[PDB]
């Protein structure tokens, strides 16, 4: 065994390994190890992504035009988000500005993605780590109802409601079917909720569950499914008539109509079921806001998302800021550019692809996706990894870093550059959490705040996307319908060779798409992705990503029952398939 | 009552399926769980992690030998032996094979388990592979798209669990039921087709009244699905129907057949 | 003036005279006068249909196969009903036997527009007679919820939901924009419910006025459309392919599903909203419990409906049972033959019509649609009524008999028949409601009895839409997929002449249709339809129809403020374009 | 701030265009009585009978003269001068023209008030006589169908309501909206009727394909309305997708252009 130092940790993989292969509960395929000592604290983690498919390798030689349909299926989880990635690149490099309803329509997308995003992953993703679901067994109905009216407006809260749910599920449970609760951690120590709690919070599982299809409906109107919407290059396809023949072919008022209908019901629920839930949570396990800080006391990065100003992608337009904190150093928030080769670096010297120099990192533009699967002295075989070996290459996704920095992206994230730019709505609201909590502002930078930021991110989107909709009607009542521009879709109107980045803040965090074209068609398409920064593996210097360093320290009660570390990683909504594309 | 034990696995896939299905508008996700089938392996959804989530594997496989349901969504790859998609240490496909021996029937659900799907586009850096070429010994009703529709999905669901049969397929194993015609042949479209009204330009006149995709690429007329019926999203809307050409996805290949925005 | 006797009334046209023109939260147009005497008491009551349209001389010369579709627009209130009945009479005269997935179908369509016209009926119609709007706004929220959740498993029941219903009439009312509560009766002395009761009952009547939309779904399915739903004589349209090429082309397991879905919430509305306001409303007006009886303890009338074996219209078939009581005479159910003379037959010598014999009944089959406006010695003018003559002619409905007896139909007739053919599900339903309300069975004979049988009804049709639903799923379990007959299709197999009645409950009660074809074309369509007897004027007797009856001996708190007469007339839920067609 | 007045009177008629109106989707029309529109008068709805009724209309129509829309569904019947429809014991057409006087504009919802509908079609025992034959001096929006689509009535309130102005019409006064195209135009199963694979009787194996119901009379070849498009009950289905061929609802004197099962 061996022992280093980076970062402030200890990185020691001396004592017990515990293997935790597969992860559930996220999307995609993901392993974990930890070592942890005597006292039953993890003293090493290894985040390891377990799948591969190579769109960055299958995207060459296609027509820029098509890419965006091609790393849509990236992820059907953040569905719509690389496409949106991908036009805004696409855009760059050719030149293209879209017009204002098109912009306006995209920031609709993903805000609705966002909504639906954060919901489930709260509930059918995060819940279960929280919620004793078979401890719901033992609730009085009547003090469930009691509570749930005490925390919220909801008006699903009767005693007969709650009972009947718990009926529900003692059927459910009753012939051992138990599905997806089978073999769970019920029962463990750190299920900290009173029954009553479980109780709600299961019947609000299932409300969410209901809820989350009627949310992408909107994707439907504007990109005719979800999952997995359409886009083009130069704007949206969804074309709009009001008040002309044949608006029955096109986006007309009565869809404007159910695309409204749908974003109040969306508000609503976010509002009064998944808010009050998330605060709950967080009133009763207090002692998770100095778990899992990793690096979100130390280097966060946003790049910024949502411009007002159509084709303007700077500080005044983006409506979700952007920025980079490096060295815990929250009062110098830094701006970042993704053309910069010394700023985004993808390093591979722990990860299962070949460079010519392993020990530097290739900003994108210069990226190489040239899978060679190499795992090196495993106990075991390379059919049968028995145990990781992190001092080489063990996992195949790829380690970003910023400024050669490792940083933490998502909820959390962005809502410390907010907040720290000073953003009012960002201050008042974390200011008033906290308060509701009795906790200082530091209880952010932890596992229960990255499902606290999540949250309130999702009440955020939700008001957004009424933002939206008015500008877009606003633009409908002046007589301004225009949802393309086709000036540059024909390839004789591209320059011969170009380049373009593509940016947003997907869910998870950060995320950009680097596409060259040249000669008609795509010669280059690289992609870093929310969860292959938090996911990481480990840098020629040996420093760790968020997930490693947000699981370092931590106390298990029971090292078989990975409870706390399914709870740590899964506040981070990992998604693997996002990660290695 | 008990209902029918279902093990629902992931190769290398999106996970667009799985959101899909608890899509459905009729029956909810939920109720298809709780009452009509036991949902009893699937790791996007499972409480178990790790040793308790491979101990319920084995368990149900092991108890419910030749009478569960095997669901797959995505697909095994056969590069670098099969470690593109490494599941509790070893090769996905050995948890495919395992899975499928003890199966009744086996659910191909998506592009990616019927036919290979986006990673299996040129030029397949994985040798993705779908599932009936790995599994040749069971019924496999392959159940296509980029998803398939929601509530395709749960139809093909309550017609298996109400008639206690598989459903009746094509030459190509995918349910006649829903694939049976074509895109291009329910399309609300296609009296601007035979008039030869299509839109040339995004957002042209044309556009805005709704006129026939053909010219931008629409791929309708070689696409079997019922997106242009029963639509997508409790019925809300379908690619076309929002304005861009059907892309094929539920087509084996669709992703080598030129441009989306050449014409058929 | 002038005083006579019949039915064990006193009817006296003495003293003043109030008119109700329009009678409103009815469909369709209809006046009510009626004499008060000194102590404020009902001694003169005068049922007047205001519209007449014409619909059995529009269907002479027309195809037998259309004539659905045309009677169809008789009532889009009770739509469908009238469809049904026409292709009933069509397969009747021409001998077409319809295949039994139609018949199951048809079934679902009726017990559909069974629970939606009852929901709405009871909310939107009869409701605000019922609940005082306007005291809602003095209710105590938490109060209201403990009301709620004290009568319902109901979800929606928590304080703060009570408090935003509240908050939203509050602001409706705030502008003086008070639209459909504008001079109401609110603070009536007969508006019995504490605040609570009135701002539960008004949360509901919003519940309600969303969820009905949702009912007739089911009539999309089957039927394309709702209002006004498309039929075949031969059985039904929708073709069933559930396992072939081309399903998508026809109803297949989606939509069985999607129809599936609407029972089961329509089924939980009306059991855990409808059933426990009936009963509230109940509890707090006991003493419209002998209040406006009428004929309800006299002559009921009920021709069945829902037969349950194809093509098979007797007593061993129909679910809902038929028959008639005459002189209070309950030990006594009579059968009903709609081809005997003898038995149904219309009168007009108080109506605006002519017959060769206006003292003598006509059968349908021998029925006579000659308009004749001749209101004679009114008050006033012929086109400025001031008061109706009701010694003369005084209304375009006519005046349906049985065996000369003046019959009450709809919900309350069919529970009395039902209730003494000795029917179990019938007995134990009423004799549970009427103990909850410790009242004695009699006391459903009135006002208030009407409005809780009308309840039942709809829980007894949510029911039944499950048993339809799951005998044909049993059938194409089975590879029965027949929807429709079609060797009598074309004319040229008709017989040259011949007949038929079709005939089934409606909401409001007994509907029939005669219909004679010849050579091709309709000879004869009559239509008696429930509130053409209900809302019947008088006869050569002077026998009194429902209404008149039931408001005979009404005391009024307020001459000018006709609540009371609202009350019962709307227990009735008059269809004035039904009656009149 | 104070929503527009609106009055809706009601002629001859069954009350179909009123239930129409409640099944909208979106809005609720809960939230267009509630926050969009003030619904002053309104026999269907409202608490008021009588005398009582008879104030609020007085009241209403004098203190918003000029600035209410008026609602007419049904229509006035010339017949018994006027006496085969009622109201307050005098003819409907008294009311009918009294709120048209007042009134800033006047939408006709439904074929009664467009055009006659079925009290219309011969003989017209009534001489019932749509709308626009009686008030020549008011603007007329027709929303015509029997009934129009509830989510298309809706649609207009909604756009009136929004963009403060009345929808642009056709030459016969109808939302170029959502009756600029006929209901062949947009229908699904018009590749069936391009390839002449027909319904020839009622469940025939053309009928479970569903193919084109030319044969059996479809009248969507000379009809104008949003039904295939737009669809019904929050796009559940509409006519045709379930079976029946349209009737020609949307159409002046489609009860007398021979019978339904008669081709076009
Ligand atoms: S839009 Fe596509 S599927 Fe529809 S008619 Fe045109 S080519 Fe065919
Ligand atoms: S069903 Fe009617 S509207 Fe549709 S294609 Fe055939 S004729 Fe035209
Ligand atoms: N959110 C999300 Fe998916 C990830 N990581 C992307 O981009
Ligand atoms: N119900 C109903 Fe209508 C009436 N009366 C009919 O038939
Ligand atoms: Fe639905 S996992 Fe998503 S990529 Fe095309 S089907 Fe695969
Ligand atoms: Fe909608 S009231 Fe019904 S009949 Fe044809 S429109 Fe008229
Ligand atoms: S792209 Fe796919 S979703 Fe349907 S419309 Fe075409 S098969
Ligand atoms: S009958 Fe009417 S409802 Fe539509 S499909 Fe034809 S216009
Ligand atoms: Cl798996
Ligand atoms: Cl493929
Ligand atoms: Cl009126
Ligand atoms: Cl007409
Ligand atoms: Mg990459
Ligand atoms: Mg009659
Ligand atoms: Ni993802
Ligand atoms: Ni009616």
Request: proline residues 6%; contains cysteine; aromatic residues 10%.
């Amino acid at each position: 065994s061996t022992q280093y130092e980076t970062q402030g940790y200890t990185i020691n993989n001396a004592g017990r390994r515990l293997v935790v292969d597969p992860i559930t509960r996220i999307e995609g395929h993901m392993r974990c190890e930890v070592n942890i000592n005597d006292q039953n604290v993890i003293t090493n983690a290894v985040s390891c992504g377990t799948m591969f498919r190579g769109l960055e390798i299958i995207l060459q030689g296609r027509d820029p035009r098509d890419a965006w349909a091609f790393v849509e299926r990236i992820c059907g989880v953040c569905t719509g988000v690389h496409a949106l990635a991908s036009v805004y690149a696409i855009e760059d490099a050719i030149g293209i500005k879209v017009p204002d309803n098109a912009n306006i329509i995209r920031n609709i997308m993903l805000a609705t993605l966002w909504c639906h995003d954060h919901l489930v992953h709260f509930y059918q993703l995060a819940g279960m780590d929280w919620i004793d679901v078979l401890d719901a067994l033992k609730a009085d109905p009547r003090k469930t109802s009691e509570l749930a009216q005490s925390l919220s407006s909801w008006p699903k809260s009767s005693p007969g409601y709650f009972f009947d749910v718990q009926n529900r599920l003692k059927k459910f449970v009753e012939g051992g079917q138990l599905g997806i609760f089978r073999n769970g951690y019920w029962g463990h120590p750190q299920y900290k909720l009173p029954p009553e709690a479980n109780l709600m919070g299961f019947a609000h599982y299932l409300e969410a569950l209901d809820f989350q299809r009627e949310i992408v409906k909107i994707h439907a109107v504007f990109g005719g499914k979800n999952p997995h919407p359409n886009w083009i290059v130069g704007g949206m396809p969804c074309a709009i008539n009001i008040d002309e023949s044949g608006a029955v072919g096109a986006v007309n008022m009565e869809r404007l109509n159910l695309v409204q209908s749908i974003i109040t019901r969306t508000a609503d629920f976010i509002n009064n079921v998944m808010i009050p839930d998330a605060l709950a949570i967080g009133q009763f396990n207090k002692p998770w806001s100095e778990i899992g800080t990793g690096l979100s006391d130390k280097c966060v990065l946003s790049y910024g998302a949502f411009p007002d100003i159509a084709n303007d992608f700077g500080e005044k337009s983006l409506l979700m800021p952007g920025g980079a904190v490096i060295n815990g150093d929250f009062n110098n928030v830094l701006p970042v550019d993704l053309v910069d080769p010394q700023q985004v670096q993808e390093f591979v010297d722990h990860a299962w692809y070949r460079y010519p120099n392993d020990q530097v990192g290739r900003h994108p533009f210069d990226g190489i996706t040239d899978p060679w699967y190499n795992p090196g002295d495993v106990k075991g075989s390379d059919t049968n990894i028995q145990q990781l070996n992190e001092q080489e290459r063990y996992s195949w996704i790829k380690a970003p870093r910023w400024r050669g920095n490792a940083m933490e992206v998502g909820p959390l994230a962005r809502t410390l550059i907010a907040y720290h730019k000073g953003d009012a709505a960002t201050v008042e609201s974390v200011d008033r959490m906290m308060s509701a909590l009795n906790l200082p502002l530091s209880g952010i930078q932890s596992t229960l705040g990255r499902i606290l930021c999540r949250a309130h991110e999702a009440q955020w989107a939700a008001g957004k996307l009424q933002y939206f909709f008015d500008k877009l009607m606003t633009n409908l009542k002046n007589g301004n319908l225009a949802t393309a521009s086709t000036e540059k879709w024909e390839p004789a109107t591209w320059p011969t060779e170009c380049r373009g980045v593509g940016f947003t803040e997907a869910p998870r965090g950060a995320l950009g798409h680097w596409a060259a074209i040249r000669d008609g068609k795509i010669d280059l398409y690289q992609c870093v992705v929310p969860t292959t920064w938090n996911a990481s593996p480990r840098d020629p210097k040996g420093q760790i990503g968020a997930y490693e360093a947000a699981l370092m320290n931590t106390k298990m009660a029971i090292p078989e029952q990975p409870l706390e570390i399914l709870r740590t990683l899964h506040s981070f909504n990992p998604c693997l398939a996002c990660s290695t594309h | 009552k008990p209902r029918i034990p279902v093990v629902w696995i992931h190769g290398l896939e999106c996970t667009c399926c799985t959101e899909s299905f608890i899509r459905s508008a009729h029956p909810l996700a939920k109720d298809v769980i709780l009452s009509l089938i036991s949902l009893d392996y699937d790791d996007t959804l499972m409480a178990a992690a790790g040793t308790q989530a491979e101990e319920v594997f084995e368990d149900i496989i092991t108890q419910y030998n030749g009478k569960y349901i095997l669901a797959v969504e995505g697909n095994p790859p056969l590069g670098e032996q099969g470690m593109f998609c490494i599941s509790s240490g070893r090769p996905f496909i050995e948890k495919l094979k395992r899975a499928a021996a003890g199966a009744s029937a086996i659910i191909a659900w998506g592009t990616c388990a019927s036919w290979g799907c986006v990673q299996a586009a040129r030029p397949n850096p994985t040798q993705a592979t779908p599932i009936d070429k790995v599994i040749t010994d069971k019924p496999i009703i392959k159940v296509p798209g980029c998803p398939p529709i929601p509530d395709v999905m749960s139809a093909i669901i309550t017609y298996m669990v109400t008639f206690d049969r598989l459903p009746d397929v094509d030459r190509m194993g995918r349910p006649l039921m829903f694939y049976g015609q074509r895109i291009h042949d329910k399309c609300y479209r296609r009296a601007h087709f035979d008039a030869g009204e299509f839109v040339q330009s995004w957002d042209d006149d044309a556009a805005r009244k709704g006129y026939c995709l053909y010219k931008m690429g629409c791929k309708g007329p070689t696409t079997y699905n019922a997106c242009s019926s029963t639509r997508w999203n409790d019925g809300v809307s379908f690619p076309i129907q929002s304005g861009h050409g059907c892309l094929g996805c539920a087509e084996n290949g669709f992703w080598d057949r030129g441009s989306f925005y050449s014409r058929v």
